[PDB]
Curated annotation (Swiss-Prot), chains A, B:
Subunit structure: Homodimer. Homotetramer. Interacts with PGRMC1; the interaction results in decreased FECH activity. Interacts with ABCB10 and SLC25A37; this interaction forms an oligomeric complex. Forms a complex with ABCB7 and ABCB10, where a dimeric FECH bridges ABCB7 and ABCB10 homodimers; this complex may be required for cellular iron homeostasis, mitochondrial function and heme biosynthesis. Interacts with ABCB7 and ABCB10.
Primary gene name: FECH
Group of enzyme by EC: lyase
Recorded catalytic activity of this chain's protein: heme b + 2 H(+) = protoporphyrin IX + Fe(2+)
Annotated consequence of substituting T219I: In EPP1; enzyme almost inactive
Stated consequence of mutating F46A: Increases activity inhibition upon interaction with PGRMC1
Entry binding sites for [2Fe-2S] cluster: C132, C339, C342, C347
Activity control mechanisms: Inhibited by nitric oxide (NO). The 2Fe-2S cluster could act as a NO sensor.
Residue positions where N6-acetyllysine is found in the record: K351
Lineage of producing organism: Eukaryota, Metazoa, Chordata, Craniata, Vertebrata
Pathway: Porphyrin-containing compound metabolism; protoheme biosynthesis; protoheme from protoporphyrin-IX: step 1/1
Organism encoding this protein: Homo sapiens
Domain of life: Eukaryota
Protein name (Swiss-Prot/TrEMBL): Ferrochelatase, mitochondrial
Length: 359, 359
């Protein structure tokens, strides 16, 4: 049975091995839609080379590479198995991985999808909360692919561009939080502070209208609602780099602040990504929770398990796709509104690519 | 019959008449918890007099004063009537207004509550979303009052310190949004962009861990969920003053950005306050209308009606108080966690004041 419906799982991706680091960075610094640099074609290769050593070291510290593809594949496999039973009218389903800066690239995935002669293609972002710098960037790649190939799609496209409050996603987070709370000494469980952590954004991006912060906040509220506000919490942000202003509080400074104020039992909850990656395995676990935590004299700091291979998460993915198919929606209503201060002409073209699709 | 349960409605307040402006500003600039100024006792009076003319002019433009007390009283009376019926066991109920910078001052209300010989006192903030600079400030006033007079409370205290997603509050916002959408030309309704607007915060405050942005974001999500995402939206922020960085996007810059990009049908929705005040009647209705207008001409820009005297809102207030009474809660779990980077000694003392109250 030839594939009928293709589910393109979009994510930035991460280098699988240390040798993949350089090209990962090179592709990223060459993404004119992601950032604008003077003589970019000359500086991109240079910046990539200068950052490679330190980044390779970070990946070495976590085993030698990113586990994103392994987790994405497991989730994709599980999603497809469920879909073939859930939606027989659109079966057989096939998942395709479309990483923005590593193989398989978004472009390579689309090429394969077209070759397979699919009837429908669904751009399914793996970021539950929409940022023009994450999901937007991947959707732009799809639009740009067809414009560069000078050909129109031979498949009918649509996108699941965000899903910050899907009930099963919320259930997965709540479940993982409860199981991690069970790992704290019973006597300290009620005193545990939950720090939801998500990749930060530069204020220049937040200030133009990026919908990310508000959606991440929505995910946090739903999770706490399901947990019946059992513990106190704060939503903080990690991964800031450079001297420019970014959205705070910073996760590292918040952990230190809490410890210095007597709150030494902390549960970190990555709330904007669904698998382990450099942000959790290195930044939170090693950079912070090993150098900071100790130096601050904390009692117990743990991190909720990433969704990774949780079967319930695969069900969440399948239900999202199933509902999307049955609704006949081309994209979210939110995608039809670009940032009030957007200055990137590709955003409007990408939005139109999806809203104009033949049904 | 003598009152048994007192509900202290907390809000910053606004000057009732132009003559009240000076002292309004004076009390605000003297509040060392809200801000630290060099030789504050000398500069506070000066800055107050310096800004009085400009602020008086703003109020003159909206009729001569703030309507906050009138709306609060109307809401309070409606709330009490419902409470006497909902909770006979805690009746009679009596509402008291406790404004932070204008009469009746928080301190004056507490004095009256104690004179009335109440058995129970509930600090009910009128800000659905918690900010250490709004609700926190009001709660500090209560703690400091008893620290000032030098004597323990003669009433049993508790607080409803936040309620960002109360189901009836959400219904009120949704109802008001739908009623305003019905005022747009039918052919442009679907084109209408919803801009939720809330008072901004300096980034220095956001970065220390203020819970406000995340809670406002939660309110927005719940409202859009009830509206079934009928229109696209963005949460933006207003009222920034000074040269320092504040949380954006700014509401005015967003309206201008939208208009310049073709979205000339906008619905403004004040989402962090429940009555009309300077922010809606002057800033949104007048200032923005005059600042824009030219060149980039808007087609239709309307503002959803503030909750004000909506009887459903009164029901929301009573439901909140009733549920609070039934649960025996002293405060939200969130209040038990101060900002990770809080540097104000009073915050912890205020928290303890409420968590330690005798039942
Ligand atoms: C000017 C540009 C900022 C783009 C903008 O937001 O306006 C910044 C971003 C990346 C910067 C470069 C990177 O930080 C890499 C180099 C760092 C060296 O210390 C200076 C040259 C160096 C080659 C930088 C030149 C310049 O400051 C760049 C190119
Ligand atoms: C800040 C930006 C998202 C918002 C924006 O579009 O500006 C994000 C998207 C991808 C991120 C980059 C990638 O994660 C690759 C690098 C990871 C390193 O740990 C920091 C630098 C690094 C080069 C990151 C800088 C910055 O955090 C990026 C560029
Ligand atoms: C840290 C890295 C330079 C590597 C190094 O020289 O050590 C620089 C190079 C390109 C920079 C990015 C680009 O200038 C694009 C963005 C510019 C914004 O003002 C800040 C975030 C922003 C996303 C920058 C983050 C960071 O300063 C980067 C990623
Ligand atoms: C130094 C202090 C900032 C303290 C803080 O971070 O809150 C700032 C806040 C308000 C400022 C004052 C107000 O802007 C009023 C005056 C404005 C004049 O241009 C200078 C003196 C003037 C009297 C200012 C002195 C100084 O810049 C102040 C006092
Ligand atoms: C920024 C601050 C809230 C966060 C904080 O604590 O810094 C808020 C609380 C009360 C606000 C002030 C009050 O609304 C009174 C004044 C209103 C005027 O329109 C602007 C200046 C004005 C003097 C405001 C400045 C600023 O927006 C304040 C001081
Ligand atoms: C606008 C007003 C008066 C300026 C002047 O008339 O010269 C000034 C005086 C006190 C200032 C505030 C105080 O300095 C306290 C805060 C300091 C933060 O860095 C910005 C917001 C902040 C809340 C300030 C907002 C604004 O600059 C204020 C409210
Ligand atoms: S930057 Fe957000 S739509 Fe373009
Ligand atoms: S400033 Fe937020 S608790 Fe003190
Ligand atoms: Cl990674
Ligand atoms: Cl007012």
């Amino acid at each position: 049975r030839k594939p009928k419906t293709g589910i393109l799982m979009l994510n930035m991706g991460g280098p699988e091995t240390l040798g993949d680091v350089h090209d990962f960075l090179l592709r990223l610094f060459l993404d004119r839609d992601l950032m604008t640099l003077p003589i970019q074609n000359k500086l991109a290769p240079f910046i990539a080379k200068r950052l490679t050593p330190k980044i390779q070291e970070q990946y070495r510290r976590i085993g030698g590479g990113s586990p994103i593809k392994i987790w994405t594949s497991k989730q994709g496999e599980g999603m497809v198995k469920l879909l073939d039973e859930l939606s027989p009218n659109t079966a057989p389903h096939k998942y395709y991985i479309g990483f923005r800066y590593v193989h398989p690239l978004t472009e390579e995935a689309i090429e394969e999808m077209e070759r397979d002669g699919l009837e429908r293609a669904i751009a399914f972002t793996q970021y539950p909360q929409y940022s023009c710098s994450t999901t937007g960037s991947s959707l732009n790649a799809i639009y740009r692919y067809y414009n560069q190939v000078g050909r129109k799609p031979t498949m009918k496209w649509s996108t699941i561009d965000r899903w910050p409050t899907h009930h099963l996603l919320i259930q997965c987070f709540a479940d993982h939080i409860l199981k991690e709370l069970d790992h704290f000494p019973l006597e300290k469980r009620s005193e545990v502070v939950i720090l939801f952590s998500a990749h930060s954004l530069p204020m220049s991006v937040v200030n133009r209208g990026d919908p990310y912060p508000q959606e991440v906040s929505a995910t946090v509220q739903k999770v706490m609602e399901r947990l019946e506000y059992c513990n106190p919490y704060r939503l903080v942000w990690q991964s800031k780099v450079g001297p420019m202003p970014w959205l705070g509080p910073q996760t590292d400074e918040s952990i230190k602040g809490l410890c210095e104020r007597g709150r030494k039992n902390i549960l970190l909850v990555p709330i904007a990504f669904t698998s382990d990656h450099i942000e959790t395995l290195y930044e939170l676990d090693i950079e912070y929770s090993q150098v900071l935590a100790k130096e601050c004299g904390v009692e117990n700091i743990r991190r909720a398990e990433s969704l990774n291979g949780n079967p319930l998460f695969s069900k969440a993915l399948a239900d999202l796709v199933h509902s999307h198919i049955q609704s006949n929606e081309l994209c979210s209503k939110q995608l039809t509104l670009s940032c009030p201060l957007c200055v990137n002409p590709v955003c409007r073209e990408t939005k139109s690519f999806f809203t104009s699709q033949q049904l």
